[PDB]
Design a protein around this nucleic acid. Structure first.
Ligand SMILES: Cc1cc2nc3c(=O)[nH]c(=O)nc-3n(C[C@H](O)[C@H](O)[C@H](O)COP(=O)(O)OP(=O)(O)OC[C@H]3O[C@@H](n4cnc5c(N)ncnc54)[C@H](O)[C@@H]3O)c2cc1C
Length: 456
DNA sequence: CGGCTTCGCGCA
DNA sequence: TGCGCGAAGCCGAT
């Protein structure tokens, strides 16, 4: 579909048909940004070829009721800033509400759209909406991978067992797909309220807030400022101040040495490809360079690979054969402690470091990367069944994490609980052959006591 | 056969 | 803290 600085492998056809004489419509779902957006850039390319400007649509689904205010305000505030950035380029953004399978298909008919383009997401709920709107339209369906540097259907054609088998595949395609983003061209001709949906939603999830003893909200919303502009400042501060000391302090939660990009990376408010471009050109510690790149290239995009080829990514069936047999044998093992969902949620466990890990999650909305494994592995060790452990982990992850409901989370949880993209270890009770993490192991690697006192 | 993200453990 | 080893199952280059 035309284009010079345009790789056709980033885009794939989902439904062929006659191209309508109306404007092309971009169904923004996962990448909520104007700059460095392949799906938006590709929508403008066909816009110029057909001499019809691009319009952007968005559907607000009730999946927000499953999460909390922290993710709702972080997402709506970025959309208000996005609405004014697209308006400066003469690109109108339309914010629908309801079922995407019935609202997107309808909006195509009333607006008489000429071409429909959407972003890529390996989640189950994304494929269900696509199959419904396909059966209700006749204009094309082009799906562009604007999140990953290398498209998911191009990086690997099967479920990759681990990273050492996926690392060479990704790095070999890097010189072809790691490129610079062309500038978003504004529209030639020009031819639902964000302020009201925010206040309507907030009053809905108000009773479901996470409160303290004195009816005080636990969440602290001054840690991460949402938006595209604020996301860029986070990257520049990470590269200039934290990139050098990443490789040595990436596993220490007492020091804020992480990029803190996951909330912006999940909602699409910042492009991972842009971060790699700025990182690759940066002159920093080579050890820290590869360590950060492997996290945002190999492990970030294997999560999409795991959720794209395994529909049951959040279930016990996606676990490898060795892990399923080990956990099935240890189902009758007596657990040293048994905690329900309410006790895990409120930090009512005998482990102060697990409670501190939960306390950081409740207050800041972003647990440290290293403590997320201990927070997840101890859940399996202190649960009725491996299914109940997976139930609690996903529920507590998708509810309070600013980067929840992401393939990065489902793959990360399956690694800690089901050994996905991992190997077997010493045989233990309850845990089985799954990788084991202990309190004493954490004490020798970082100052645990400093982590506890910070979060009570 | 070699080697696996992030494991624990003994010992400078 | 930093290093080498242990315990475990299996992909994939041959
Ligand atoms: C049990 C568990 C649950 C997780 N839940 C989520 C989640 O809900 N949402 C989420 O985005 N990630 C999740 N992670 C993955 C990882 O912990 C986070 O991406 C990271 O901690 C976010 O902090 P950061 O961006 O500052 O880390 P950084 O060190 O700055 O990481 C840079 C980027 O690399 C990617 N990345 C980092 N660590 C991992 C990892 N272990 N696996 C895959 N990609 C990674 C992310 O895109 C991240 O933004 C989870 C991991 C585990 C083990």
């Amino acid at each position: 579909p035309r284009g010079s600085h345009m790789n056709p492998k980033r885009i794939r056809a989902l439904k062929s048909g006659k191209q309508g004489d109306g404007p092309v419509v971009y169904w923004m779902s996962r990448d909520q940004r104007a700059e460095d957006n392949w799906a938006l850039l590709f929508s403008r390319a066909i816009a110029k070829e057909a001499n019809v400007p691009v319009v952007v649509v968005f559907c607000l689904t009730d999946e927000f009721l499953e999460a909390g205010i922290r993710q709702y305000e972080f997402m709506l505030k970025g959309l208000q800033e996005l609405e004014v950035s697209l308006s400066r380029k003469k690109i109108p953004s339309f914010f629908l509400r309801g079922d995407p399978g019935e609202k997107i298909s309808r909006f195509v008919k009333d607006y008489n759209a000429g071409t429909l383009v959407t972003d890529f997401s390996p989640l189950r709920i994304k494929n269900q909406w696509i199959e419904k709107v396909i059966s209700g339209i006749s204009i094309p369906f082009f799906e562009v991978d604007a999140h990953n540097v290398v498209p998911c259907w191009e990086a690997s054609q099967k479920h990759e067992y681990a990273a050492h088998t996926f690392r060479p595949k990704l790095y070999a395609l890097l010189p072809e797909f790691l490129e610079e983003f062309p500038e978003l061209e504004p529209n030639s001709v020009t031819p639902e309220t964000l302020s009201d949906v925010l206040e309507t939603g907030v009053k809905a999830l108000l009773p479901e807030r996470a409160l303290l003893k004195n009816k005080d909200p636990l969440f602290e919303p001054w840690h991460f400022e949402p938006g595209e502009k604020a996301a860029k400042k986070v990257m520049e501060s990470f590269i200039a101040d934290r990139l050098d000391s990443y490789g040595a302090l990436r596993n220490d939660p007492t020091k804020n040495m992480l990029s803190n990009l996951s909330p912006y990376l999940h909602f699409g408010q910042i492009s991972s490809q842009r971060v790699v471009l700025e990182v690759e050109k940066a002159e920093s510690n080579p050890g820290s360079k590869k360590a950060f790149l492997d996290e945002i290239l190999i492990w970030k995009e294997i999560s999409d690979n795991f959720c794209y080829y395994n529909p049951g990514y959040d279930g016990f069936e996606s676990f490898p054969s060795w892990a399923k047999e080990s956990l099935n044998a240890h189902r009758n093992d007596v657990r040293s402690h048994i905690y329900t969902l309410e006790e895990f949620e409120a930090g009512k466990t005998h482990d102060p470091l697990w409670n501190a890990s939960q306390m950081e999650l409740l207050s800041t909305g972003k647990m440290h990367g290293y403590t997320r494994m201990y927070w997840a592995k101890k859940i399996l060790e202190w649960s009725e069944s491996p299914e109940k452990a997976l139930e609690i982990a996903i529920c507590l992850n998708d509810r309070y994490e600013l980067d929840g409901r992401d393939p990065n989370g489902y793959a990360g949880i399956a690694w800690s609980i089901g050994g996905v993209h991992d190997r077997a270890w010493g045989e233990r009770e309850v845990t089985g052959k799954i990788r084991y993490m202990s309190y004493e192991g954490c004490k020798r690697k970082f100052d645990v006591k400093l982590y506890i006192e910070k979060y009570s």
